[PDB]
Write an enzyme that holds these catalytic residues in place. Structure first.
Site, PDB file in Angstrom:
ATOM      1  N   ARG A  48      29.605  56.526  -5.328  1.00  0.00           N
ATOM      2  CA  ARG A  48      29.310  56.004  -3.991  1.00  0.00           C
ATOM      3  C   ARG A  48      29.774  56.927  -2.891  1.00  0.00           C
ATOM      4  NH1 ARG A  48      31.690  51.579  -6.049  1.00  0.00           N
ATOM      5  NH2 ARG A  48      30.286  50.139  -7.096  1.00  0.00           N
ATOM      6  N   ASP A  87      30.142  39.648  -7.189  1.00  0.00           N
ATOM      7  CA  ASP A  87      30.702  40.639  -6.289  1.00  0.00           C
ATOM      8  C   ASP A  87      31.699  40.027  -5.332  1.00  0.00           C
ATOM      9  OD1 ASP A  87      29.144  43.174  -6.675  1.00  0.00           O
ATOM     10  OD2 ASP A  87      27.462  41.768  -6.426  1.00  0.00           O
ATOM     11  N   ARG A 124      17.968  48.115  -1.277  1.00  0.00           N
ATOM     12  CA  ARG A 124      19.308  48.591  -1.339  1.00  0.00           C
ATOM     13  C   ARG A 124      19.373  49.649  -2.420  1.00  0.00           C
ATOM     14  NH1 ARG A 124      24.854  45.045  -0.924  1.00  0.00           N
ATOM     15  NH2 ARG A 124      26.213  46.867  -1.252  1.00  0.00           N
ATOM     16  N   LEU A 125      20.044  50.744  -2.097  1.00  0.00           N
ATOM     17  CA  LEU A 125      20.204  51.832  -3.047  1.00  0.00           C
ATOM     18  C   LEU A 125      21.647  51.789  -3.507  1.00  0.00           C
ATOM     19  CD1 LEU A 125      19.321  54.649  -4.340  1.00  0.00           C
ATOM     20  CD2 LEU A 125      20.143  55.688  -2.246  1.00  0.00           C
ATOM     21  N   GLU A 126      21.851  51.726  -4.826  1.00  0.00           N
ATOM     22  CA  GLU A 126      23.178  51.750  -5.378  1.00  0.00           C
ATOM     23  C   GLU A 126      23.414  53.089  -6.091  1.00  0.00           C
ATOM     24  OE1 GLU A 126      26.955  51.344  -6.303  1.00  0.00           O
ATOM     25  OE2 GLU A 126      25.918  50.242  -4.691  1.00  0.00           O
ATOM     26  N   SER A 131      26.699  47.000 -13.617  1.00  0.00           N
ATOM     27  CA  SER A 131      27.102  46.163 -14.738  1.00  0.00           C
ATOM     28  C   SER A 131      26.620  44.762 -14.462  1.00  0.00           C
ATOM     29  CB  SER A 131      28.617  46.158 -14.848  1.00  0.00           C
ATOM     30  OG  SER A 131      29.117  47.444 -15.184  1.00  0.00           O
ATOM     31  N   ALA A 141      31.800  34.491 -12.428  1.00  0.00           N
ATOM     32  CA  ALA A 141      31.184  33.422 -11.643  1.00  0.00           C
ATOM     33  C   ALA A 141      32.160  32.803 -10.659  1.00  0.00           C
ATOM     34  CB  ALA A 141      30.634  32.317 -12.569  1.00  0.00           C
ATOM     35  N   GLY A 142      33.441  33.180 -10.767  1.00  0.00           N
ATOM     36  CA  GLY A 142      34.457  32.737  -9.824  1.00  0.00           C
ATOM     37  C   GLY A 142      34.339  33.477  -8.498  1.00  0.00           C
ATOM     38  N   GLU A 171      27.535  41.846 -21.627  1.00  0.00           N
ATOM     39  CA  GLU A 171      27.256  42.924 -20.672  1.00  0.00           C
ATOM     40  C   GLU A 171      25.939  43.732 -20.913  1.00  0.00           C
ATOM     41  OE1 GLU A 171      30.742  45.401 -19.858  1.00  0.00           O
ATOM     42  OE2 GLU A 171      29.752  46.532 -18.224  1.00  0.00           O
TER      43      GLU A 171
HETATM   44  N1  LIG Z   1      30.646  42.164 -11.948  1.00  0.00           N
HETATM   45  C1  LIG Z   1      29.885  41.768 -12.967  1.00  0.00           C
HETATM   46  O1  LIG Z   1      28.870  40.808 -12.785  1.00  0.00           O
HETATM   47  C2  LIG Z   1      30.109  42.309 -14.327  1.00  0.00           C
HETATM   48  C3  LIG Z   1      29.271  41.893 -15.356  1.00  0.00           C
HETATM   49  C4  LIG Z   1      29.486  42.356 -16.625  1.00  0.00           C
HETATM   50  C5  LIG Z   1      30.526  43.262 -16.846  1.00  0.00           C
HETATM   51  N2  LIG Z   1      31.349  43.686 -15.825  1.00  0.00           N
HETATM   52  C6  LIG Z   1      32.493  44.584 -16.162  1.00  0.00           C
HETATM   53  O2  LIG Z   1      33.610  44.467 -15.254  1.00  0.00           O
HETATM   54  C7  LIG Z   1      34.014  45.762 -14.854  1.00  0.00           C
HETATM   55  C8  LIG Z   1      33.113  46.186 -13.698  1.00  0.00           C
HETATM   56  O3  LIG Z   1      33.584  45.612 -12.502  1.00  0.00           O
HETATM   57  P1  LIG Z   1      32.679  45.633 -11.162  1.00  0.00           P
HETATM   58  O4  LIG Z   1      31.273  45.272 -11.548  1.00  0.00           O
HETATM   59  O5  LIG Z   1      33.477  44.716 -10.299  1.00  0.00           O
HETATM   60  O6  LIG Z   1      32.779  47.211 -10.722  1.00  0.00           O
HETATM   61  P2  LIG Z   1      31.842  47.862  -9.544  1.00  0.00           P
HETATM   62  O7  LIG Z   1      32.065  49.383  -9.552  1.00  0.00           O
HETATM   63  O8  LIG Z   1      30.375  47.589  -9.730  1.00  0.00           O
HETATM   64  O9  LIG Z   1      32.441  47.047  -8.242  1.00  0.00           O
HETATM   65  C9  LIG Z   1      33.836  46.969  -8.028  1.00  0.00           C
HETATM   66  C10 LIG Z   1      34.162  46.318  -6.685  1.00  0.00           C
HETATM   67  O10 LIG Z   1      33.447  46.927  -5.609  1.00  0.00           O
HETATM   68  C11 LIG Z   1      32.450  46.013  -5.148  1.00  0.00           C
HETATM   69  N3  LIG Z   1      31.201  46.759  -4.892  1.00  0.00           N
HETATM   70  C12 LIG Z   1      30.071  46.813  -5.694  1.00  0.00           C
HETATM   71  N4  LIG Z   1      29.154  47.606  -5.090  1.00  0.00           N
HETATM   72  C13 LIG Z   1      29.683  48.053  -3.909  1.00  0.00           C
HETATM   73  C14 LIG Z   1      29.146  48.876  -2.904  1.00  0.00           C
HETATM   74  N5  LIG Z   1      27.892  49.364  -3.054  1.00  0.00           N
HETATM   75  N6  LIG Z   1      29.931  49.145  -1.781  1.00  0.00           N
HETATM   76  C15 LIG Z   1      31.206  48.626  -1.680  1.00  0.00           C
HETATM   77  N7  LIG Z   1      31.721  47.811  -2.671  1.00  0.00           N
HETATM   78  C16 LIG Z   1      30.965  47.524  -3.768  1.00  0.00           C
HETATM   79  C17 LIG Z   1      32.344  44.851  -6.179  1.00  0.00           C
HETATM   80  O11 LIG Z   1      31.988  43.555  -5.725  1.00  0.00           O
HETATM   81  C18 LIG Z   1      33.770  44.851  -6.678  1.00  0.00           C
HETATM   82  O12 LIG Z   1      34.623  44.201  -5.743  1.00  0.00           O
HETATM   83  C19 LIG Z   1      33.656  46.680 -16.002  1.00  0.00           C
HETATM   84  O13 LIG Z   1      34.619  46.512 -17.028  1.00  0.00           O
HETATM   85  C20 LIG Z   1      32.324  46.072 -16.436  1.00  0.00           C
HETATM   86  O14 LIG Z   1      32.151  46.137 -17.825  1.00  0.00           O
HETATM   87  C21 LIG Z   1      31.154  43.191 -14.564  1.00  0.00           C
END
Ligand SMILES: NC(=O)c1ccc[n+]([C@@H]2O[C@H](COP(=O)([O-])OP(=O)(O)OC[C@H]3O[C@@H](n4cnc5c(N)ncnc54)[C@H](O)[C@@H]3O)[C@@H](O)[C@H]2O)c1
EC number: 2.4.2.-
Length: 204
Positions: A48, A87, A124-126, A131, A141-142, A171
């Site tokens: 990012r 998120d 939106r571009l990520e 995940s 879901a919390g 996942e």
């Molecule tokens: N979050 C899920 O729905 C999900 C689902 C399955 C597995 N996982 C697992 O959990 C962990 C991944 O955690 P994650 O998904 O929270 O990591 P992430 O890198 O996708 O995001 C981490 C944090 O940053 C936030 N974020 C996401 N995109 C952002 C952006 N574009 N700009 C600013 N902030 C942003 C998220 O809400 C979170 O608070 C890994 O172990 C993965 O296997 C997560």
């Protein structure tokens, strides 16, 4: 058309495991995914911050991203499917970091209206990987924001759960530099979360 939404944990589980057997990931690809689950937020966050470019990164990190990207040549979904994701407030922008949530745990209806304006009917571009889960699982879901992604058939998507360092996530991983279109944004029955519905597209 119609996106398959899994309703039962033991079915999603089986379907996903059925996909993983087919992938035949190289031993090298497997070590790269295992490591991603242990360090997703570090990796996705560097992605990012340097808007996609990986030349600055250490020589390990470059080996790991290339292997992740490659992986998706073997990992695609066989049918239209719904993935789920949770998120935190920063997902919407720094502005919502300390304002999206009220003192009782409800979604501040005003921030919701601002976020809806800022994101609804827009792409939106990520820069990082995405995940997701086969269902809205207990753990993620919390979180205040739930996104349901429509993923088309033949799209890059992989069920890495079996070799994840962590459990209970069902996942599915999607590739970095993916872009998605947000179709809806409403509140849930109790007003404690935002439900985003989005259409997924390709990478770059
Ligand atoms: N979050 C899920 O729905 C999900 C689902 C399955 C597995 N996982 C697992 O959990 C962990 C991944 O955690 P994650 O998904 O929270 O990591 P992430 O890198 O996708 O995001 C981490 C944090 O940053 C936030 N974020 C996401 N995109 C952002 C952006 N574009 N700009 C600013 N902030 C942003 C998220 O809400 C979170 O608070 C890994 O172990 C993965 O296997 C997560």
């Amino acid at each position: 058309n119609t996106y398959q939404e899994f309703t039962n944990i033991d079915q999603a589980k089986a379907w996903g495991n059925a996909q993983y057997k087919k992938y035949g990931l190289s031993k090298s690809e497997k070590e790269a995914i295992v490591s991603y689950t242990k360090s997703a937020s570090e990796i996705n966050g560097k992605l990012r911050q340097n808007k996609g470019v990986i030349n600055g990164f250490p020589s390990n990190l470059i080996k790991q991203v290339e292997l992740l990207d490659k992986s998706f040549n073997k990992m695609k979904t066989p049918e239209n499917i719904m993935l789920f994701r949770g998120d935190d407030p920063a997902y919407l922008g720094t502005e919502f970091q300390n304002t999206l949530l009220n003192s009782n745990g409800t979604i501040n209806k005003t921030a919701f209206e601002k976020a809806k304006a800022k994101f609804l009917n827009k792409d939106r571009l990520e820069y990082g990987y995405i995940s997701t889960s086969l269902m809205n699982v207990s753990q993620f879901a919390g979180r205040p924001i739930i996104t349901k992604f429509k993923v088309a058939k033949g799209s890059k998507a992989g069920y890495i759960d079996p070799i994840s360092a962590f459990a209970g996530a069902l996942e599915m991983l999607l590739p970095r530099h993916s872009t998605y279109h947000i179709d809806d944004m409403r509140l849930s029955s109790d007003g404690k979360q935002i439900i985003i519905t989005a259409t997924m597209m390709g990478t770059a």
